[PDB]
Amino acid sequence: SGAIYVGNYRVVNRHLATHNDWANLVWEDSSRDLLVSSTTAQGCDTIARCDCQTGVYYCSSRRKHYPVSFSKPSLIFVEASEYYPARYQSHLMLAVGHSEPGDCGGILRCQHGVVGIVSTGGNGLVGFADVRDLLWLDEE
Ligand SMILES: CC(C)Oc1ccccc1NC(=O)N1CCC[C@H](C(N)=O)C1
Ligand SMILES: [Zn+2]
């Protein structure tokens, strides 16, 4: 589990969104596994606006932050899970790293800020849903 709190927005994995998230919905996209809801309190996270391909992510199944090299956001095939059938997920970046069911939501960050959140994994891989192209998170 995990979320990004930027301004008056909460960014979470769409497959882990709560009823309160759906009842205060700002934007959602199943193809990216992202959902954004509105919040009453202001958040402290800042979004990265860069082209970094190295950063650090939080892995809840190890209570550790790991440095990783990750691919550019692209369309990747993801195996069937209890949340989605086997399909192509867009704006996904892959890296070599530990991930397990429960690790979704952990933040990936670079020197410029938050890059994205854990969304996929398996066999020594971890995939992150990019959020750097969502410019509207920085305003309104
Ligand atoms: C990060 C962890 C949950 O990943 C795994 C780690 C080890 C084995 C499987 C997964 N599961 C996985 O890749 N998911 C399940 C949840 C929905 C994801 C999606 N965005 O389509 C796909
Ligand atoms: Zn950066």
Resolution in A: 1.5
Whether the CB-CB separation of 66 and 54 falls below 8 Å is answered with no
The DSSP code for 47 is: B
Q: Where does the chain break, by residue before each gap (C–N > 2.5 Å)?
A: none
Phi, psi of 14 (to 5 degrees): -55, -35
35 vs 29: CA distance, rounded Å: 6
Instruction: Provide the residue ranges of all domains of the chain, joining segments of one domain with +.
Output: 3-44, 45-140
Instruction: For ligand 1, say whether the CB of 100 is within 6 Å of any of its atoms.
Output: yes
Active site amino acids = 15, 33, 104
Whether 129 lines ligand 1, by a CB cut-off of 6 Å, is no
Q: Is 98 annotated to bind ligand?
A: no
Which method, experimentally, gave rise to this model?
A: X-ray
Tokens of 16: 């882990």
Token duo for residue 31: 């193809």
First to last CA, the chain: 26
CB count within 10 Å of CB 37 equals: 21
Nearest ligand to the C-alpha atom of residue 115: 2
- Plot region of 128 (φ>0 → left; ψ -120 to 50 → alpha; else → beta): beta
**At residue 48, what is the residue type?**
A
∠ at Cα 30 (65, 135), nearest 5°? 65
Point out the ligand nearest to the CA of residue 52.
2
Q: Is 59 annotated as a binding residue?
A: no
**Was 110 annotated as part of a binding site?**
yes
Does residue 83 line the site of ligand 1, with CB under 6 A?
Answer: yes
Report whether residue 117 contacts ligand 1, using a CB cutoff of 6 Å. no
